[PDB]
Amino acid sequence: SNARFSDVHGCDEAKEELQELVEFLRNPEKFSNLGKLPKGVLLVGPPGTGKTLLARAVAGEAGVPFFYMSGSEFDEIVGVGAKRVRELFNAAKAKAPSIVFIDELDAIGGRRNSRDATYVRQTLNQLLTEMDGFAQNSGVIILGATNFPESLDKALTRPGRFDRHVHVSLPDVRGRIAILKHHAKKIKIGSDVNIAAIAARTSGLSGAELENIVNQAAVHASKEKAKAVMQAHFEWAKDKVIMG
Numbered sequence: 001s002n003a004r005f006s007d008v009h010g011c012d013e014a015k016e017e018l019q020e021l022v023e024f025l026r027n028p029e030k031f032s033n034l035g036k037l038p039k040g041v042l043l044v045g046p047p048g049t050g051k052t053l054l055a056r057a058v059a060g061e062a063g064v065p066f067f068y069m070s071g072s073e074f075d076e077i078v079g080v081g082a083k084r085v086r087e088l089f090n091a092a093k094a095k096a097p098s099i100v101f102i103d104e105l106d107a108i109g110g111r112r113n114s115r116d117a118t119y120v121r122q123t124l125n126q127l128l129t130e131m132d133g134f135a136q137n138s139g140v141i142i143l144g145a146t147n148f149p150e151s152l153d154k155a156l157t158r159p160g161r162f163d164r165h166v167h168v169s170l171p172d173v174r175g176r177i178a179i180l181k182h183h184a185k186k187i188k189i190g191s192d193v194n195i196a197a198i199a200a201r202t203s204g205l206s207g208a209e210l211e212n213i214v215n216q217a218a219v220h221a222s223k224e225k226a227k228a229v230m231q232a233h234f235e236w237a238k239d240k241v242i243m244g
C-alpha cells in the first residue's frame with residue numbers, strides 16, 4: 001500500500017497546501033478549467049521531516065505513479081546524468097498523471113570543479129529541458145526536496161520551473177506528540193507511558209527519529225519479555241536515538 005496523508009503528522013500546513021497537488025493529479029482537466037497550474041514544487045526542510053513521505057503521500061492520495069530520483073546520484077562526479085534525467089521523465093510522461101520526486105535537488109547544478117563543469121551543465125540543462133517541455137495539461141508534477149534552498153541553481157527557481165515551495169520543518173512539541181501517538185498506534189502502550197513527557201524531551205528531533213523511538217522502545221520491551229511497552233522503554237529508546 002502506498003503512503004497517505006494520514007501517515008504524515010506534525011506538519012498539517014504542508015499537507016493542506018499539498019492537497020491542491022492531489023486535486024490536480026486526480027483530474028488535471030477539471031483543475032485547469034477554473035483558471036495557474038503547478039509544475040515544480042520545492043519541499044524545504046531538514047532531513048527526516050517527511051519530505052519523501054509527503055511526496056509519496058501525494059502520489060498515493062491521487063492514485064498516480066511515483067518516480068524517484070536522487071541528486072546524490074551525481075556526488076562522485078560517474079555516468080551520463082542527462083541520459084538518467086531524460087529516461088526518468090520519459091517514463092513519467094508515459095504514465096501521466098504522475099509524480100517525479102527529485103531528492104537533494106541542490107546537488108544538480110552545483111558549482112563543483114571546472115572538470116565537473118561539463119558534467120554538471122549537461123545534467124542541469126537536461127532537467128531544465130524536460131520541465132520547459134511540458135505542454136498544456138501534461139499531468140507530471142515535479143517535487144524537489146532540499147535542505148539548502150540557498151544552494152539551488154538560479155535556473156531551477158525561475159518562473160515556470162520550481163517557482164513554488166512548501167516548508168517541512170522540524171515538529172514542535174505539539175507535532176512531536178502527534179507523531180509519537182501515530183506510530184504508537186501500532187504498539188501495546190503501557191500504563192505508565194506519558195507521550196507528552198517524551199515529546200518535551202525530544203526538541204529538535206525529526207519525525208523519522210521519533211518513529212525510531214517508538215519502534216526501538218517496542219523492540220526493547222519485547223527483548224525484556226515485558227507485557228507492554230513502558231515509559232522506561234521509551235526513555236531508553238529516546239536516549240539511544242538522541243545519542244545516535
Ligand SMILES: Nc1ncnc2c1ncn2[C@@H]1O[C@H](COP(=O)(O)OP(=O)(O)O)[C@@H](O)[C@H]1O
Pocket residue numbers: 007008009010011045046047048049050051052053054145179206207208209211
Ligand atoms: N512528519 C512525519 N510524520 C510522520 N512520520 C514521519 C514524518 N517525517 C518522517 N516520518 C517517518 O520517518 C520516515 C522517513 O522520513 P522521510 O520521508 O524519508 O523524510 P525526509 O525525506 O524529509 O528526509 C518516514 O517513512 C516516516 O515513517
